[PDB]
Write a protein that binds this DNA or RNA. Structure first.
Lengths: 95, 99, 109, 82, 108, 93, 82, 99
DNA sequence: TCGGATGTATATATCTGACACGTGCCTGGAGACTAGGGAGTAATCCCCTTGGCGGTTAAAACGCGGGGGACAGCGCGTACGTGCGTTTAAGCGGTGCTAGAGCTGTCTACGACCAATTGAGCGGCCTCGGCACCGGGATTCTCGAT
DNA sequence: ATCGAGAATCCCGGTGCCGAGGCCGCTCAATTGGTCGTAGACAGCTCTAGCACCGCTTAAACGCACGTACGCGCTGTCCCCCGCGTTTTAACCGCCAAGGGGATTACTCCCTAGTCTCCAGGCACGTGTCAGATATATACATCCGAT
């Protein structure tokens, strides 16, 4: 019978890689490391947003909580650029 | 001629006196002004609860006392008794604040 | 911009907006999850991934390789000043160490 | 408060903070160095405290903002709430 | 225990079992909360509180006092070898430090 | 008007149970409240992660027991595990 | 596998680990010290790994148990899952 | 008489050679035996995935390399080039592992 | 070894303000019940962990000569400690004002939930091009000889 | 300063394998569409506490002079790590084989969520009194220049 399926971020990391460097490949251990990186950062940002919505007695995690968690967690220029990217994405999605 | 202690006696006396106590060692108004100046280059027209400035002072003093303990350890390692800026630099580098 | 398609495509990303929604919603972070939180989080994750991958690709091309290995990710991370502050307590497996000899140990005149 | 208040962290205050740390002799160039260090630490905490204050849409920096900013740096503080 | 009274009194504790249950259910830790988790957590919290309070009371009596202050909690914590490992990254306000002079600095 | 909750009366019961003659000041009680809250959130977060790793959706008493084994040092962990086990066993019977 | 395997961490191995750290000269008493500092570190990680393995009611120590035990001590590790 | 380098040349050559590489520096079977011995004084009749022992080895080697960097910093602070046990002790104390 | 001189512990009066305790009440916890799905348990399969040879050869162990670095001692001279007289501004109390934190009531738009549907992503094949490796030659540090 | 011999490392071309990149079949998770109840946005009001000012006392910061203990540089001895050659031990690799236990599926039951009612524990507020901070006066321990 069948073996259960396990999800990862491999095809999306590969799409991004073919966007940035159109003719570079990636090995398998490097892709494992990239998966661990994406999971780590996801859990950091989500936990910070959870605490930040609990401090203010809210029940909802909105894009404002995510933006403030990004401002808290990342260093300076990284934070500025990530905030600009997220804002642009949300605006393009809504409009 | 008047009485006079040798260099190193009043230093140990003050070490005992200040390790025996729990007061705050920086003056309150200068520290509050420093805090307001920094915060006002972060955002204009801010107000502070008094508990906020008191918490900031407690944290800063605890940090500096720990750093000075580590600095003394380094200065003794180099076979000295005087602490120098290179001791603070080594302590903050090994500790993880200058990488 | 209105759409009837996959949300990742109307948002302008190459990263799953629906999977991130399900992970935020089934992960015990809050009772409710807004509609614009997975879009923001996907965009931030894509930015950081693209940054690291670009630096690592430069490091791989500087060694005449057509493929990224953990050594190149280690180099790209340690040689940046902000990615090294975001990942300062992390160990990359099979990554190695930056070449750095203290100046006092080299031979003298 | 605007200009040059770090010189209000006088030299006797640093001698006292060093005596509580167990230091017997101090070099004349420590003071400047110490001030530098202090400023950096402060600028990291306040920057976080204000970030919480802007999120709650407040204009008063509460003591809980400072306690949270310190807790997220690995410097938990007991006695001011939380 | 068949007696149907308050849960803290049924479990044998002084800490609140119902308040801990509510804090576990409304804190976003899991989807469900068993019936024996608040009892266990209340018992552990009460044990640790009793430990620290006993050491601090000894430290207060050693200084001819009838009342505990933050200095005594600081002393009791830093002088125990395991409570110092559990609370090694914590700052007690108005607590001071432990008296400690490096042996190299004393007059010879 | 609002009312705030704390652990003051329970800390005071424990104190008058272990030291029948000493009192406690107000700042010391603030510190004790912060301590109880800190340890509560540590243990609860560790138990949440333990239940998530194993794909469970319930925090039972063995999640709390394993979180206590992970968080506290040796003899503290042993005595806390014994106390919690005794409390649960007395509660069900 | 019961007795005295810490001497399997030979002296050339410690010297290689020191060379990767940038060390030019090594004292003859370093080795006996390094076999101590290692044996402690290991004992803290395995003790946690096994604690996870007993919770899942397993008898095999998985790599995820080790990754979690390391993440819990502030030593996140990329490349083995997680 | 045969060729011979001066003391300190092959050391720098090995520093470059081993900072340039990414291999594992401890032998595999001795480390696996050490791991099994420790774990078996924690619980009897355990089994290990191979990935588990590999992860343990990566973590241990990374830890020891970082510790040796800090030790070299201390040894240079004391105006030496040879690292000694007191340097490891000072590094682990300031770092936060011996309090 | 030793009498000043200075600093610190000790004993008593006294006076305040914070700790300990009582009271009303209201909101959160307990009692009783029902419904549904999470988890405990049994059974089966097959992956991957452990144990065992045998060979080859890379690496560890051992010994030896010697050069360089650790460490102790000595001398000088600048920088830090101690104590005194003067200057500065912190700390304390009281007055007064207003910004903004905190709470309540109303209503509407946003997110949970449920059933149908269909295509994005995962597991399995598989093939060829990048990377590992061999070897031969070129160049480039290193060192003892002037 | 220099040059020549000898190890060591880089470079270049050829050979071969195996893992990365891409295709295909298919299941299940994301999307569509509609409904509904309540979280939160917003307006309005109150009244706490944060800010600004003013005068007075005095504690602490500041500036300065003197001298001494400590930092630092230099010299000399000696021992202990380094580099190298020879021998020995056991890691590593490929292979064979058995079976434990991890992983999945099916079934059932009992434990926890949810709803409503009732009532008493804990919180806000008031108030009395005694533990502790402080002034003052001695008594004793410690440090230092003089022998």
């Amino acid at each position: 019978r069948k073996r259960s399926r396990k999800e990862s971020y491999s095809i999306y990391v590969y799409k991004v890689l073919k966007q940035v460097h159109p003719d570079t490949g990636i090995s398998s251990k490097a892709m494992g490391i990239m998966n661990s990186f994406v999971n780590d950062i996801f859990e950091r940002i989500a936990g910070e947003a959870s605490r930040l919505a609990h401090y203010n007695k809210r029940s909802t995690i909105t894009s404002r909580e995510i933006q403030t968690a990004v401002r808290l967690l990342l260093p300076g220029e990284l934070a500025k650029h990530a905030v600009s990217e997220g804002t642009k994405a949300v605006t393009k999605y809504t409009s | 001629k008047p009485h006079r202690y040798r260099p190193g006696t009043v230093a140990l006396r003050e070490i005992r006196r200040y390790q025996k106590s729990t007061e705050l060692l920086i003056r309150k108004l200068p520290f509050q002004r420093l805090v307001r100046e920094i915060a006002q280059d972060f955002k204009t027209d801010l107000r502070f609860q008094s508990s906020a400035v008191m918490a900031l002072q407690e944290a800063c003093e605890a940090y500096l006392v720990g750093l000075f303990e580590d600095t003394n350890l380094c200065a003794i390692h180099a076979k000295r008794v005087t602490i120098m800026p290179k001791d603070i630099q080594l302590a903050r580098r090994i500790r993880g604040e200058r990488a | 911009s209105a759409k009837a398609k996959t949300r990742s495509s109307r948002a302008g990303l190459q990263f799953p907006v629906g999977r991130v929604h399900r992970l935020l919603r089934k992960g015990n972070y809050s009772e409710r999850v807004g509609a614009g939180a997975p879009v923001y989080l996907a965009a931030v994750l894509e930015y950081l991934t693209a940054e690291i991958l670009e630096l690592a690709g430069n490091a791989a091309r500087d060694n005449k390789k057509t493929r990224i290995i953990p050594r190149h990710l280690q180099l790209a991370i340690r040689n940046d000043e902000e990615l090294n502050k975001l990942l300062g307590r992390v160990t990359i497996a099979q990554g190695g160490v930056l070449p750095n000899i203290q100046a006092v140990l080299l031979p003298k005149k | 408060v605007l200009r040059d208040n770090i010189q209000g962290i006088t030299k006797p205050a640093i001698r006292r903070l060093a005596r509580r740390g167990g230091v017997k002799r101090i070099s004349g160039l420590i003071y400047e160095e110490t001030r530098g260090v202090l400023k950096v630490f402060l600028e990291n905490v306040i920057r976080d405290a204000v970030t919480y204050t802007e999120h709650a849409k407040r204009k008063t920096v509460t003591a809980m903002d400072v306690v949270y900013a310190l807790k997220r740096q690995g410097r938990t503080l007991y006695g001011f709430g939380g």
